[PDB]
């Protein structure tokens, strides 16, 4: 992968302005190729570790706190970053820059301040849950709560035709698995689509560092 990737590292021993300026340096390196017509992917491996460093250098510059002692412009801190990840028009050159920010949550609390600041910026989200991670489902993508906002216009047509009914089968399994925890033995059609959904779950598992092509 190092034939085409750039790794920007601002580590924990480095001062707080380097963790503050690491994603913006990554986006400037991405925009160099975006405004040449190339397609760039940018991954911020913890964007909730940028907010702590920006909180640090704001509170040490004697700026007043807010919720959870973050400053006022922490939404603007992430949104000024993430709105530079666009897909340009054909007059601008045609290049894009897709972003993948990460946010670590605390005990699954997606209603915290930095998760709800970054959820409201991105074009959808992918929920990784330990409750599904330790049930065998790895990758731990909660396919019900994970939203794609572009979705369908992103996919190719062959993925579209069959994902449209994958989603229905898996949503039916998620709805009817609740009535199979205890009790009184659901009938044959409901058990047929429970078996359909369990095989859907076994399809959607993968292993580590081996991606699959689209076909």
């Amino acid at each position: 992968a190092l034939d085409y990737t750039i790794v920007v590292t601002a580590s924990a021993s480095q001062p707080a302005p380097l963790l503050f300026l690491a994603p913006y340096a990554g986006v400037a390196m991405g925009e160099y190729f975006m405004y040449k017509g190339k397609h760039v992917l940018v991954v911020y491996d913890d964007l909730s570790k940028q907010a702590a460093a920006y909180r640090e250098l704001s509170l040490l510059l004697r700026r007043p706190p807010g919720r959870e002692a973050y400053p006022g412009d922490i939404f603007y801190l992430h949104s000024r970053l993430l709105e530079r990840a666009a897909k340009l028009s054909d007059a601008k050159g045609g290049g894009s820059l897709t972003a993948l920010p990460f946010v670590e949550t605390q005990a699954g609390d997606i209603s915290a301040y930095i998760p709800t600041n970054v959820i409201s910026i991105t074009d959808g989200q992918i929920f990784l849950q330990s409750d599904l991670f330790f049930s065998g489902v790895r990758p731990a993508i909660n396919a019900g709560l994970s939203v794609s906002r572009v979705g369908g216009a992103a996919q190719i047509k062959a993925m579209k035709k069959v994902a449209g009914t994958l989603r229905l089968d898996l949503a039916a399994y998620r709805e009817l698995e609740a009535f199979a925890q205890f009790g009184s033995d659901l009938d044959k059609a409901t058990q047929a689509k429970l078996a359909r959904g369990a095989r859907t779950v076994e399809v959607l598992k993968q292993d580590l560092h081996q991606p699959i092509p689209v076909e």
Binding site: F134, S135, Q181, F182
Partner: protein
Amino acid sequence: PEIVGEEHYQVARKVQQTLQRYKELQDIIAILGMDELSDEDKLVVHRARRIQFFLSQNFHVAEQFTGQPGSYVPVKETVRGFKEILEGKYDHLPEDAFRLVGRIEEVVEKAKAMGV
């Protein structure tokens, strides 16, 4: 799987899967009890109590706390012991026979001294 091996990894992940399913069943057990589980969830609970108690171990340092001399379990023997618990080989033993015990033969001899 590339570090601890394949068998170690499957035993570890199946241990974690049964303990996660038992953690999911905690609320149904808390309100409605063991009575309504659908005969595989009863087996999940029945094995996960044994797995949760065979994670506990007597220490050399804890001899001053309890008088029990304490153990040193190699990796092959704890993988073999948890694999034999997952296979159903020790479902007949009581669950208090698995507490504070080094290897799985000591589970057998402690259940023997309990009177099973």
